[model samples]
Target: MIDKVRAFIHRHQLLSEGAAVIVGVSGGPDSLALLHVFLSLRDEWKLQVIAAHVDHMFRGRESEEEMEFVKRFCVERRILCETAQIDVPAFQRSAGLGAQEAARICRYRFFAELMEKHQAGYVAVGHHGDDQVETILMRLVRGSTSKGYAGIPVKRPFHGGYLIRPFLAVSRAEIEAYCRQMGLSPRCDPSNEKDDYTRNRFRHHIVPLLRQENPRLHERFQQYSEMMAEDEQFLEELAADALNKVMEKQHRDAALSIGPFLELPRPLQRRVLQLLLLRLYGGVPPTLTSVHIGHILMLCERGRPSGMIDLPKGLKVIRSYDRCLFTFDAESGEKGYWFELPVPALLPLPNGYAIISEFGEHYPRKQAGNDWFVVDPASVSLPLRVRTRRRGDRMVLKGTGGTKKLKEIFIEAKIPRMERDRWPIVEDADGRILWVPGLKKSAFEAQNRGQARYILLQYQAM
Candidate 1:
């Protein structure tokens, strides 16, 4: 197993010879094995292994015991040990983050300081193959980007040194077996056995089911991750080049011409949009999903040449003629959606859908279900209006006669988050909502019309 780790380290160029490496020990079997593995290699590589442990101040006495176990374990081997006590719970409250996120932030900050102090070239942690598989599976179950599904990286830069994970070559079972063979009693974190946490839930239930299929699933998962990592590197370079050439302006309000953007392959187009968002927002928000990217593509392809879609974090994506611009507009809500619909005319929407309204001599027997709306000509004041939803928008339900907020209606309807802003709502000139095409028809719809002429409004979702 050590030989496999040694090869993984060399193949990835994770560390240099005679380098000072910090082993982030949590007193668990995985990390305990990592510390001893490096200690075993100390003579051959002329290495310095420093054991670093943190008491996150969780579980009070139990956590304190784990810290002592790590220190004693290091002393028994005559390996230098560095440890710290961090109040992660207190930090969690102030930082407004979950326990996992807050603990990690505090823990890595400690690692960074120690790295600078020791001038270490590498900080090795015991994130094994099982962790990799779990991360990949977890991300897939939840929604993630194409790149995000690749899972945790084997090594990434941290502070002055590189944070490396050589144990990714081995599985959790192997590490525990190694502990048994060496007669090492590694301290256990009780929380790990609990199923409340999402990661623990997957580890307890899903991972075993997956392992039933193949005991060496972690290895296959790791290989898949590395392959995706390589592919992502190449595609990112190509996307960057394509974006640079097509961009009209790259700063402040980043603008690109659509004619050239639309010509690229669809994969590259999605990547470029992802890249553009990274540049515009500085980083991706948790709420920004692939749905946001798809909407931008729709805005460019089928939307009216001069429309805008608001994105997360108050960022606005505006399309005008052939130019697509991304900018932060403080008062972007002022870019309202209002369209004039004259009686007896056909008006095409920015999207393929259209609204056709005409005078009706009589109430037609077949009005094409809910898509066709009948209005008494004398009841409603013309000309009717077609507009997008706005804040506080409400409509009286055709059957219930109860006014419902558009936001609530959207939730009940399961409207796509991106489509909510563009969904059309028809209203009378008096500002009373009359109909919502492809959705609900307002109470203004004519229910009881006799021999009197009627106003017919048709909605087409082409």
Candidate 2:
């Protein structure tokens, strides 16, 4: 196993000789095997190997023991080791994220922090061929499009560094065999044995059935993932071309001519529109439903007049004369009508952004004009609510006694009109604007450290 990994790394030029590489050690079979193999190849690959672990602290003592095991292993090998302990449950609750997502969030945060602290260029993880198979299988069950089969990337950018799956092509069997030969026994998470998780179900049951249908199922899935990724890349390139030819700068936004869409081949038209809608609304726009697509096509066939369709994620499809526009509104209405704000909380919009602010701590030295501000916390009423900026909303700016119109402030700030509407604002129940989303806060509500106290808030999406 060591020789195989060494050969693959050398062949692919995955590492720079003597460069720093951080290995994610979860005390699992794959990761343990990875650490061993990479250590063996350290001389040939010419790199420094450092192992790190993140204790998600989800499974009580088990998580702690896993971190301990990894720590001991690294210590025995005299490898520089780091570990991050996080509150997964609390984070999951606060962020309204599922258990899986919370764990992923904790893992990546630790990986990025460790990489920066250690000055490592790449983060290595133990994702093998079997993992890719299970991932693709899960995507298929969840109704992924052809692009879903892109499998796992060999390497991708992370928060402050890069993540590389060096054993993406190597099978699970090979990794275990290597561990056994090296006299190593890796820890296995009890959760992995349960079928509650979708990935585990696919790994425990579906993968065997797939293997029966084709003995070399892993290789087949890998090949399919590669092919699909290539195909998707080409389609995206085609989409770029179509958008280039069809786009017109209509005021602050770009316009896609409906004539160009209706004139193009049907499949290309659908793909182009999907790309355009996604770029506007961000994620898979749920509002751009299949029914909506069919309705739009019907409207196009009969040469219907200009119209608009409401979409999820503050997006809208505006049909103009011979053109359809995908407009993203930053001022869209709030989804969760209920929101409570403490004096200094950074409030997040539905899309997971917060207008963060502090109180009364002005810079002693001159600073670049900043979006951050310190506001008075005492003047505000309790039980603040989040709301979208509506017409006629007004607020008092700091040092300016007169109330200013929201539109005027946006114009002075050079905020595009489209974005201004979608920007979330926190308001007192009395209808007083407290903090403008992603911008400034009302002067009276800004924090003052000792005399009044500071309020700091952030917004994010789950």
Candidate 3:
């Protein structure tokens, strides 16, 4: 067992020569074995092992004897020890986290503190191979990202130190056997023991059956874990690069061209979407699943030019033609605006945009196309009004001279249904609808064939 752990530590580069390590010991068989292994290697590697323990304050002092158990062991072995009685319940209430997570948070906080106090290079823990398998299985049973499926990491950065787990190289049974061989009687509970709300259930039943097939199941699981970590790292980098290029707009809301997003490889598509949600929500919620991500992908691919899917935490993704927008305000897509336009003035509107009206001496290089509109002042009333669609609002097609309702025009334009409520409309002072941004332009627009001076109406993001 010692040989296996030493080899695993070397293989993973978990420690450096003459390094200080703060080991987290819970007085359990697994942690006790880890505590002993480090002691065995202490002289050979010039290692300093400071045993650390946390009670989590689950009950009073009597119920938290686990701390006492570890302290006794450290005293007998003449080793330095650190122990804390963290008020995890109070933390759970204050932070709004469950018991398990709250305990983990407080425990790690203590670990980080010890790392700083001792200037330790590594915070070692006793997470065995079974822990890795159970974590992976639990993540799969619930819902998680590709990285989450990779399970418990052997080493991760923490408090300017590495959180290392050498026991991931061996199984729980091997640790127990080592305890017997070394004559180390660690703390124990009754009835063969159980812990965690879910992990224990898996450990007490599912794990042993799988181990029966191959007593050394942990080695294979650890190998798979390392493999996944490497693959996830490579793929994550690729997805981040693709997402940077794919996103055209990312502020409080996100907008991307469906063409570019869908063109990405399938795995990248899923990963990019996951990355996007992480950015928008600051973190992915427990409610978000790959199934919902799949729904979002299909939303952009369906023949319907307009669709939307509401995600967790009020984020709504609305697909409009070639564009997909992710926003939070419920009415952002349906909100209406009605305001008068003053000549040679820029006005900020409610829909996160501004309208600019000014005169140009020469015709614009490009005509109206949802961006800027050129108008002949003499052709229609001056000082136009820009508002959202009202009942019975209609416009004459610039080329056909035929009339159409704003509702039908929006459908034909392939604009999203929710966006029509907020879409801007340019109307003359006399109330004649003249333009609908890039969607349609009225016949009253400047011909530019004989016009030297013209009025320009532009859509500007505020």
Tens digit of per-residue lDDT, candidate 1, span 1-462: 778888887888756455788889874666788888888876667788899988776556557767888888889989889988877577566767667776677888889988998899788888889989988988888877486677787788888768888888888878888877876764334556567679888989899998999988998999999999899879989999999988996466778889999999988998888888887766654645667888889988985665678888878787766778777764324333688888788888865688888877767678457677888878878777888888798889877759988889876776654467767888888989888876788887786657688777788867
Model 3: per-residue Cα lDDT over 15-63, one tens digit each:
6455798989874666777888899887668888899987765555434
Please report, as a residue range, the 10-residue window in candidate 3 with the lowest summed lDDT: 185-194
1 or 2, greater by TM-score: 1
Better of 1 and 3 by TM-score: 3
Task: Assess candidate 2 and give its TM-score to the true structure.
Answer: 0.64
- Name the candidate that leads on TM-score: 3
* Cα TM-score per model: 0.68, 0.64, 0.80
Ranking according to TM-score, highest score first: 3, 1, 2
User: Which digits, one per residue and each the tens of the lDDT, describe model 2 over residues 343-456?
Assistant: 555555554466554443542232423344434445666566766677688997656767788878776676644456566777776778866755666766453345535554
- Candidate 2, residue 368: CA error in Å? 60
The list of candidate 2 runs beyond 4 A from truth reads 3-18, 186-191, 262-271, 284-302, 330-462
lDDT of each: 0.80, 0.67, 0.79
Listed per candidate, the RMSD to the true structure in angstroms reads 14.3, 19.2, 4.9
